[PDB]
Every structure is written in structure tokens, then in C-alpha cells.
């Protein structure tokens, strides 16, 4: 553990804002369609945070054009310019898998303003 931790500490980002499942974040994802590179904003609710150290990931869920879409990112990926916290949600559990079954008004999360 300590040795693997030391090998990877160099690549941990330090610009991670404090966010937890249920918060709404805007993820600034770098996309490449060829030579050019671009930022595509994926905004939605964090439904999952798992792992530790360099292997930590999180999942953001949004409903686009009627279809639920989940994106999982490595927390420390350089391919994400910025993780922006839009709103703080009030939830009661670490994993928000139950939102997958809900839609529209039922899937709403109350803001808490941390």
C-alpha cells in the first residue's frame, strides 16, 4: 500500500473540489475528433464515488433527449480540465443507483447550499 501510494502521489490532482454523491457537477471533458481538441460539458448529478487514491472514480448521470446517460471518469484524469460543482444536493446514501428507475419530477434532489 505505502509503496504503491508513493509511486502514484505524483499524478494525483489537487484541484478537485469537495463534492459528494447527489451534488450537481459540470465536468469539463476534453474530446478529440481528429487533430483538433475540444471541451464538451457533461453536467449532471454525481451518483457514485468509489475507489481510493489514483484509482478513485465517480459517475455523473444526466437525462439528454429523454435518455438517461451515465459517464464515469477517473477522478484524477488529465483529460478533464475542471470539475465544477454546480449545486449541493441533499441525499441520504453514498450510491444513488435508485435514481436510474425514476424520471422527471421523481428524480429531483433538494438543494442544501453548503
Amino acid at each position: 500500500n505505502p509503496l504503491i501510494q508513493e509511486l502514484t502521489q505524483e499524478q494525483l490532482r489537487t484541484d478537485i473540489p469537495a463534492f459528494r454523491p447527489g451534488d450537481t457537477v459540470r465536468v469539463h471533458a476534453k474530446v478529440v475528433e481528429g487533430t483538433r481538441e475540444r471541451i464538451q460539458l457533461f453536467e449532471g448529478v454525481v451518483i457514485k464515488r468509489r475507489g481510493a487514491g489514483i484509482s478513485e472514480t465517480y459517475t455523473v448521470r444526466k437525462v439528454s433527449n429523454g435518455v438517461g446517460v451515465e459517464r464515469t471518469f477517473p477522478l484524477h484524469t488529465p483529460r478533464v480540465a475542471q470539475i465544477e460543482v454546480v449545486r449541493y444536493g441533499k441525499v441520504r446514501r453514498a450510491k444513488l443507483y435508485y435514481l436510474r428507475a425514476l424520471h422527471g419530477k421523481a428524480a429531483r434532489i433538494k438543494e442544501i447550499r453548503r
Binding site: 509503496l3 504503491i4 509511486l7 499524478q11 476534453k30 489514483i54 484509482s55 477517473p74 484524469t77 488529465p78
Partner: protein, 206 residues
């Protein structure tokens, strides 16, 4: 090129250009050449390498005498490496992870994790019989063979002890070499439980 280390564990690393790749951490505290074998004496050329200093009370007079020529403490793992430039090696010389460079293509050998007595489904990837429709044939190894020989042919695969086998993974990529930590990062996964002996050699197919 070759070295002996211990399997520390698996993690992941971001490369340049942002790709995420799994790596296995192999820690190889410098190995010591204990003996050089030549055609003149042994009939074949090889170097005998020692890794992982061992406490004195865990060693023997025969073992302590063997490593005396190299002038080192007792070593837990002793292996031979063939097809090298013997003249470039001598007893007591140290081999460090910096022998390998990032981007080198290697072969990694280890002892697969033990699994104990296992059935032919897990051990040999065989197919179950149906689980319903009156079936009383679920995890059994299949017909032992035709009637005519009045016997079972060899290599009829059955249950038995699984794992604990030498396995070599070929054409793995060395991702990083942290010499101050005596650590080599290998892309992908390799055989063996954590803390088990791992042998890194330059890829034979290269």
C-alpha cells in the same frame, strides 16, 4: 537482461496524452550475481542471481558459504539467467532495475495463485450439463471415453489441484523504472500472489 523482484500489487498510471493503463508494481531490491557458470565447468553458460536479503538465522552454513564468494548476505530467491553476456557479469556484481528502460518489451514469469482442489468446470473451462429438465448432470467432467479401449486415455481432464504453476506472460511493456525505490512498473497484470517471486526478462520474441 533480467532481474528478480517481488509482486507488490496492481495500480494504474496516466501516460502522456492522458491514457489510463493498469500496471503491476514489481519491487526488485538489487540482485547479486552469486555464481557464473561456463561451458568449461558446467557445460552451459548462465549467471546465478540472488534476490531479497534473508535473516542470518534463516540461513545455513552451506547457504552462507555459497554466497560468501559474492560477499553478500543470505538470499531467499536464487535463480539462473541464460543467454546473456557472461563476461559482462562477475560474482558479487549487483543488478538493478535500471537495467530495464521504460518502453522495453519483457517476458514476466511467476507462479500462479493456488486454488486448491477444483472441478473440471473451473479447472478446464468445461461446460455444465443442464440445470433443469430432469438433469442430474451439473458439474461433472463428461464421458471418460469410448468403450473399445477398455480404459481411459491419458489427458482425460478431471478435477484436481489448480494453480501454483509456473506461467510466463510474453511481450509486456515496461512503463516506468523508479530506481531509488527499486520498482519496475509493468503494463498489465502478471501471475502470482502479492509478495511472490517474479522474474522479468527481455522478451524472447523481440
Amino acid at each position: 537482461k533480467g532481474i528478480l523482484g517481488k509482486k507488490v500489487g496492481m495500480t494504474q498510471i496516466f501516460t502522456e496524452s492522458g491514457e489510463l493503463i493498469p500496471v503491476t508494481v514489481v519491487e526488485a531490491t538489487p540482485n547479486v550475481v552469486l555464481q557464473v557458470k561456463t561451458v568449461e565447468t558446467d557445460g552451459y553458460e548462465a549467471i546465478q542471481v540472488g534476490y531479497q536479503d534473508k535473516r542470518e538465522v534463516l540461513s545455513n552454513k552451506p547457504a552462507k558459504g555459497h554466497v560468501a564468494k559474492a560477499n553478500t548476505a543470505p538470499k531467499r530467491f536464487i535463480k539462473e539467467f541464460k543467454n546473456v553476456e557472461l563476461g559482462e557479469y562477475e560474482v558479487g556484481k549487483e543488478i538493478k532495475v535500471d537495467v530495464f528502460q521504460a518502453g522495453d518489451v519483457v517476458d514476466v514469469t511467476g507462479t500462479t495463485k493456488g486454488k486448491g482442489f477444483q472441478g473440471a468446470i473451473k479447472r478446464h473451462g468445461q461446460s455444465r450439463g443442464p440445470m433443469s429438465h430432469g438433469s442430474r448432470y451439473h458439474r461433472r467432467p463428461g464421458s471418460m471415453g469410448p468403450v473399445a479401449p477398455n480404459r481411459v486415455f491419458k489427458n482425460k481432464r478431471l478435477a484436481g489441484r489448480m494453480g501454483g504453476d509456473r506461467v510466463t506472460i510474453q511481450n509486456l511493456e515496461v512503463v516506468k523504472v523508479d530506481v531509488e525505490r527499486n520498482v519496475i512498473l509493468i503494463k498489465g497484470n502478471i501471475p502470482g500472489a502479492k509478495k511472490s517471486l517474479i522474474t522479468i526478462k527481455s522478451a524472447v520474441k523481440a
